[PDB]
Amino acid sequence: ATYAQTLQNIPETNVTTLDNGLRVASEESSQPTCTVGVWIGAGSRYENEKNNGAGYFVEHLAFKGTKKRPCAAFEKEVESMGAHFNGYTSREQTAFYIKALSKDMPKVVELLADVVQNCALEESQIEKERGVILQELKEMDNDMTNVTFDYLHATAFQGTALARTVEGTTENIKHLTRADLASYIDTHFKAPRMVLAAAGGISHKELVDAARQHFSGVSFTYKEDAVPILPRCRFTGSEIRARDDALPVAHVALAVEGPGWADPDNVVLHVANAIIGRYDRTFGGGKHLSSRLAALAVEHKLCHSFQTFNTSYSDTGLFGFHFVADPLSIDDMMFCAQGEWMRLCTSTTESEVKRAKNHLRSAMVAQLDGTTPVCETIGSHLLNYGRRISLEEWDSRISAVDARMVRDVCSKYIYDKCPALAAVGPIEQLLDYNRIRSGMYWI
Amino acid sequence: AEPEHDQRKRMGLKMLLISALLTSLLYYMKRHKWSVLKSRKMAYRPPK
């Protein structure tokens, strides 16, 4: 029963829209258990300077209870049905979802609706979470990788909204008002911008009837039905070096502006990132690993790890790589890294893309390893790509990619481009933007 | 005393022209690369 076929067999993802704008979608499996959630098209990018951190503060309350069912009432009801509720909030995408028995499919939707709509926002709890978020910041600040990507955005998108952290400023957390969290919810958590997605043993029809029932938003004026278009974020070849010779290792991330969800090149970009891949000191492969960079990394003890990435966004994106190294091998590593990038633009081989494509498909499949991940793909696809994109399609697109294509596309986005750099730790060895800028050409 | 006299001067003319064009293009070039440093901003954010 060849791969090809198993692909065209996976049940189609159904989507139906309500009069309020809400879009309900789902992929039905025989699974006795399931996952359902609302993927809102909101994040820190929608926040401005005065409320940076709202969507995150709000994330901390969508679970402390609603108007109808207060704290214990909510938790008790949810804990007692063996369900798992949890979510997240990115720069331009927020999500809240539950993992429950396909049986409870309809009661969950009710619960979801009650959260996005009737958050209690108990002004008593607010002051508590305020101290919690402040505490999580102290912690997240010790996560070099995070510090490094935030900074990456901080300078690559300096001057724009995309250059803000999701968690927000220490001041905003200390001062946001119930009212602020209030309007945040009112302004963003809106039907035409939300997506009720589900995966598992669930009837799409049953799913949508339940949606109609509690997700009964009303829309009178045109304004309400409209989805705002965010102001464009300006990428800037720049660098931010936060140095502290006291930290054990050093983090380095370099990137170029990426196209954005909609753009087909992304496929090619992924196939490329698939060649250089990623590495880490516990990869059994060793000196024989296929990725030259990885291989080089191993042969020269160049880094405790490295990883490529193609972080997409609506209108923009970040295509780069990140590596952790010892103070004294930062240069050799950076050198080799740009080396492979230049190689991508100038000499990618068919054999490489062949391996890359296979590896990619495999990752593509792992993206749908369970109701939750599958669900996450739906919520995001609709939200980002507008519709759903089947593995059969992705797989198609991927197959079209070839060396020539990789080189052209990579040259297009990499060659002779002013990159964005972020470095943290004992970064004295790696140095000079110029020296790095010249690494952008010839290979 | 100096037959080259005339050519010596014609060369001087060409020399000045090139020297101007070139010193200029090289001043721009030196500046370009150095801007990275000229506008460079820094800050001391000790931990607390």
CATH number of this structure's domain A238-441, picked from the four choices 3.30.230.10, 3.30.420.40, 3.20.20.70, 3.30.830.10 = 3.30.830.10
Other beta carbons less than 10 A from residue A177's beta carbon: 12
Identity (one letter) of the amino acid at A66? T
Q: What is the DSSP letter of A66?
A: B
CATH number of this structure's domain B4-48, picked from the four choices 2.40.110.10, 1.10.357.10, 1.20.140.10, 1.20.5.100 = 1.20.5.100
Token couple for A4: 């090809």
Contacts of A432 in chain B (CB under 8 A): 36
Residue A227 class from Cβ within 10 Å (0-12 exposed, 13-18 middle, 19+ buried)? exposed
Nearest-by-CA chain A residue for B45: A242
Question: Which residue(s) pair with A423 in the sheet?
Answer: A241, A252
Instruction: Using alpha carbons only, give the angle A150, A155, A156 rounded to the nearest 5 degrees.
Output: 95
Token couple for A307: 């990883």
The CA-atom distances, in angstroms, between B16 and each of B6, B12, B26, B27 are: 16, 6, 15, 16
Taking the CA of residue A239 and the nearest CA in chain B, the distance in Å comes to 10
**Helix residue ranges, H only, A141-279:** 144-156, 170-175, 178-188, 204-214, 222-225, 265-276
Mutate to test the interface with A, among B34, B36, B42 (most CBs of A within 10 A): B36
Whose CA is closest to A271, among A387, A354, A204?
A: A354
Resolution stated for this PDB structure, in Å: 3.0
Identity (one letter) of the amino acid at A331? D
The CA-atom distances, in angstroms, between A280 and each of A157, A307, A335, A410, A426 are: 28, 9, 18, 24, 20
Q: Tell whether B33 is within 8 A of chain A (Cβ).
A: yes
- What backbone phi and psi angles, to 5 degrees, belong to A312? -85, 160
User: Contact at 8 Å (CB) between A316 and A162?
Assistant: yes
Contact at CB, A432 and B33, closer than 8 angstroms: no
- At the topology level, CATH places domain A13-226 in Cytochrome Bc1 Complex; Chain A, domain 1 (3.30.830)
Q: Tell whether B32 is within 8 A of chain A (Cβ).
A: no
Taking the CA of residue B17 and the nearest CA in chain A, the distance in Å comes to 31
Secondary structure of A99-167 in HEC code, one letter for each residue: EEEHHHHHHHHHHHHHHHHCECCCHHHHHHHHHHHHHHHHHHCCCHHHHHHHHHHHHHCCCCHHHCCCC
Taking the CA of residue B31 and the nearest CA in chain A, the distance in Å comes to 12
Contacts of B44 in chain A (CB under 8 A): none
Rounded CA separation A256/A304 (Å): 23
Taking the CA of residue B25 and the nearest CA in chain A, the distance in Å comes to 19
Q: How many CB pairs under 8 A join A and B?
A: 5
User: Contact at 8 Å (CB) between A144 and A425?
Assistant: yes
- What backbone phi and psi angles, to 5 degrees, belong to A31? -40, 130
Rounded CA separation A397/A268 (Å): 9
Say which residues have a Cβ less than 8 Å from residue A287's Cβ, sequence separation at least 6: A295, A298, A299
Whose CA is closest to A235, among A424, A2, A420, A32?
A: A420
Rounded CA separation A234/A160 (Å): 7
Nearest-by-CA chain B residue for A141: B47
Q: Is A422 in a helix, a strand, or coil?
A: strand
User: Contact at 8 Å (CB) between A419 and A152?
Assistant: no
Say which residues have a Cβ less than 8 Å from residue A209's Cβ, sequence separation at least 6: A106
Q: How many residues in total does chain A contain?
A: 443
Longest dimension (CA), chain B: 81
Whose CA is closest to A70, among A111, A122, A105?
A: A122
A393 is known as an active-site residue: no
Mutate to test the interface with B, among A433, A436, A437 (most CBs of B within 10 A): A433
> Catalytic one among A59, A92, A352, A376?
A59
H/E run at residue A38: strand A33-40
Nearest-by-CA chain A residue for B34: A434
User: Contact at 8 Å (CB) between A277 and A291?
Assistant: yes
Contacts of A433 in chain B (CB under 8 A): 36
Q: What is the DSSP letter of A233?
A: P
Rounded CA separation A255/A434 (Å): 15
A residues 242..261 contacting B (CB < 8 A): 242
Say which residues have a Cβ less than 8 Å from residue A423's Cβ, sequence separation at least 6: A148, A239, A240, A241, A242, A243, A250, A251, A252, A253, A430
User: Contact at 8 Å (CB) between A283 and A294?
Assistant: yes
User: Contact at 8 Å (CB) between A408 and A304?
Assistant: no
H/E run at residue A359: helix A350-366
SS3 content of chain A, % helix, strand, coil (to 5): 50, 20, 35
Strand A238-243, strand A420-425: pairing: parallel
User: Contact at 8 Å (CB) between A370 and A232?
Assistant: no
Rounded CA separation A200/A393 (Å): 21
Residue intervals in chain A for CATH 3.30.830.10: 13-226, 238-441
Nearest-by-CA chain B residue for A241: B42
Q: Alpha-carbon torsion A368, A373, A374, A378, what sign?
A: negative
Token couple for B14: 């060409």
The CA-atom distances, in angstroms, between A418 and each of A237, A343, A346, A376, A427 are: 4, 17, 18, 34, 20
Say which residues have a Cβ less than 8 Å from residue A221's Cβ, sequence separation at least 6: none
Q: Tell whether A49 is within 8 A of chain B (Cβ).
A: no
Rounded CA separation A273/A94 (Å): 26
Whose CA is closest to A152, among A52, A257, A50, A49?
A: A257
Identity (one letter) of the amino acid at A360? L
Contacts of B33 in chain A (CB under 8 A): 434
How large is the C-alpha radius of gyration of chain B?
A: 23
Taking the CA of residue A342 and the nearest CA in chain B, the distance in Å comes to 22
User: Contact at 8 Å (CB) between A430 and A423?
Assistant: yes
Q: Tell whether A432 is within 8 A of chain B (Cβ).
A: yes
Other beta carbons less than 10 A from residue B38's beta carbon: 7
Secondary structure of B2-24 in HEC code, one letter for each residue: CCCHHHHHHHHHHHHHHHHHHHH
Token couple for A424: 């943290």
Strand A23-28, strand A14-17: pairing: antiparallel
Contact at CB, B33 and A434, closer than 8 angstroms: yes
Rounded CA separation A115/A93 (Å): 17
Whose CA is closest to A425, among A252, A266, A259?
A: A252
User: Contact at 8 Å (CB) between A98 and A107?
Assistant: no
Q: Where are the domains of chain B?
A: 4-48
Rounded CA separation A338/A419 (Å): 11
Q: Is A282 in a helix, a strand, or coil?
A: coil
Contacts of B36 in chain A (CB under 8 A): 432-434
Rounded CA separation A375/A199 (Å): 5
Q: What is the DSSP letter of A440?
A: G
H/E run at residue A353: helix A350-366
Q: How many residues in total does chain B contain?
A: 48
Token couple for A261: 């969800």
